[PDB]
C-alpha cells in the first residue's frame, strides 16, 4: 500500500512537494505532550540514578524536552504529509470513476416505512 | 394577574349574611380584629416594597422559537437539517406536556369548586379532558426511552396505515 506512490523517489523523508502543507504551529498540543514525555523521561532518569529528582534537572530536563520537541516535530510534519497524500488519492480516484461509486439521490423521510415496535 | 380565560374563575356567588338569631359574634370579633391586626401591618409593608420595586423597572421577555421544515424536508441522513427539526419537535412536545398539565389542573379545581355536585358542572371540562388526553394518548404515548421524530412520524405512519385498512373494510 502506497509504496507505488513513494517508491518513485525512495527514502525521501518528506518530498519537496510537502512544503505546500501548513506546518504544525508551535503550541500544537501533540508536540507539547511530547515535551511532557521528555519531562517524565528525565524524571525516570533521575529516579534511576539514586539522586533525588528535581536535582540535576536544570540542564538534563531541558535536554530531554527539547530533543523530543525536535524529533516529534519532524514526525508530526511528515505525518500530516502522509494523510494529505492519502486524502488526495481518495478524491482523485473518486472523480475519475463515475460507475464504481454511484451518486444516489437521498430521498426524504416523506417516503420511508419502518416497523418500530413500541414498548407495549 | 394570570390570563383569565385560560384558568376560569366562575361567578363568586357569595351569599348574604343573615344573623337570624341574636347572639354573640364569635368569629366576627376576630375577623375584624384580624383585619385590624394582620391586614394593615402587612399591607403597609407590601405596598412599601411595591413602590421600592416600581422606582426602577425591568423588562424581561418570553422567548420565541421560529418554525422550520421539521421532519419532512430532511433527507434520510445528513443530520445538519435533522437536528433543528427533531429538537424543536422536543420543544413542542414539552409544550404539549404543559397543556396536559393545564387541563388536568382545571379538572381538579373544578371538582373542588363544585362541592358535592361532582358530576354537575364538570361534564364539559372533563369532556374536553378526555378529548385532549385521548389525543396525547394516541400520539406520544408508547415510544420508549429513546425517541426523537423518526419514532413519532413512525407511529403516525402506523396509524395511517391501520386506518387505511380500516377504511377499506369500511366499504
Ligand atoms: C541507509 C539505509 C539503512 C537501512 C537499515 C536501517 C533500518 C533497519 C533498522 C531500523 C528499523 C526501524 C523500524 C522499521 C522501519 C521504519 C521505516 C520508517 O519509519 O521509515 C520512515 C521513512 C520511510 O522512507 P520512504 O517512505 O521514503 O521509503 C521507505 C518505504 N517503506 C519503508 C514504507 C517501505 O524513512 C526515511 O525517511 C529515511 C530517511
Ligand atoms: C513539577 C515538579 C515535579 C516534582 C516531582 C517530585 C519530586 C520528588 O522528589 O519526587 C520524588 C519521587 C521519587 O521518590 P521515591 O520514594 O523513589 O518513590 C518511587 C515510588 N514510585 O519521584 C516522583 O515523585 C516522580 C515525579 C513526579 C512528577 C509529577 C508531575 C510533575 C508536573 C507535570 C505534570 C502536569 C502537567 C500539566 C500540564 C498542563 C495541563 C494540560
- Domain borders along chain A are 1-97
Strand partners, A108: B75
Cell of B159: 396509524
Q: How far B99 CA lies from chain A's nearest CA (Å)?
A: 24
Measuring CA to CA, how many Å separate A26 from each of A33, A60, A69?
A: 12, 22, 10
User: Which residues in A lie closer than 8 A to residue B78 (C-beta atoms)?
Assistant: 106
Q: Report the interhelical angle of B123-139 vs B150-168 (nearest 10°).
A: 110
User: Which residues in B lie closer than 8 A to residue A114 (C-beta atoms)?
Assistant: 150, 154, 157
Indicate the residue of A108, A116, A120 with minimum beta-carbon distance to B74.
A108
The span from the first CA to the last CA of chain A, in angstroms, equals 52
The H or E element spanning position A43 is: helix A29-48
Strand partners, B75: A108
Record the resolution, in angstroms.
3.9
Are B142 and A119 a contacting pair at CB < 8 A? yes
Cell of B57: 423597572
How many angstroms is it from A15 CA to the middle of ligand 1?
Answer: 15
Distance CA B107, CA B113 (A): 10
**Measuring CA to CA, which residue among B143, B167, B166, B171 is closest to residue B156?**
B143
Distance CA B36, CA B26 (A): 16
Amino acid at each position: 500500500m502506497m509504496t507505488g506512490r513513494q517508491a518513485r523517489a525512495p527514502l525521501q523523508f518528506l518530498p519537496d512537494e510537502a512544503r505546500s502543507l501548513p506546518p504544525p504551529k508551535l503550541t500544537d498540543p501533540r508536540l507539547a505532550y511530547i515535551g511532557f514525555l521528555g519531562y517524565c523521561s528525565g524524571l525516570i532518569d533521575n529516579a534511576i540514578r539514586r539522586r533525588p529528582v528535581l536535582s540535576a534537572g536544570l540542564h538534563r530536563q531541558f535536554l530531554y524536552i527539547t530533543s523530543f520537541v525536535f524529533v516529534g516535530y519532524y514526525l508530526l510534519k511528515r505525518q500530516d504529509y502522509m494523510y494529505a497524500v492519502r486524502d488526495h488519492d481518495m478524491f482523485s480516484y473518486i472523480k475519475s470513476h463515475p460507475e464504481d461509486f454511484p451518486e444516489k439521490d437521498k430521498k426524504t423521510y416523506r417516503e420511508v416505512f419502518e416497523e418500530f415496535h413500541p414498548v407495549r | 394577574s394570570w390570563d383569565k380565560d385560560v384558568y376560569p374563575e366562575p361567578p363568586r356567588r357569595t351569599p348574604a349574611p343573615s344573623p337570624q338569631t341574636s347572639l354573640p359574634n364569635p368569629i366576627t370579633y376576630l375577623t375584624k380584629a384580624f383585619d385590624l391586626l394582620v391586614d394593615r401591618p402587612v399591607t403597609l409593608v407590601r405596598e412599601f416594597i411595591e413602590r421600592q420595586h416600581a422606582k426602577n423597572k425591568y423588562y424581561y421577555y418570553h422567548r420565541e422559537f421560529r418554525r422550520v421544515p421539521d421532519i419532512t424536508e430532511c433527507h434520510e441522513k445528513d443530520v445538519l437539517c435533522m437536528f433543528e427539526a427533531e429538537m424543536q419537535w422536543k420543544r413542542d412536545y414539552k409544550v404539549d406536556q404543559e397543556i396536559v398539565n393545564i387541563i388536568q389542573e382545571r379538572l381538579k379545581a373544578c371538582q373542588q369548586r363544585e362541592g358535592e355536585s361532582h358530576r354537575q358542572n364538570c361534564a364539559k371540562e372533563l369532556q374536553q379532558f378526555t378529548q385532549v388526553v385521548k389525543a396525547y394518548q394516541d400520539r406520544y404515548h408508547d415510544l420508549g426511552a429513546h425517541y426523537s421524530a423518526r419514532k413519532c412520524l413512525a407511529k403516525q405512519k402506523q396509524r395511517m396505515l391501520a386506518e387505511r385498512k380500516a377504511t377499506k373494510e369500511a366499504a
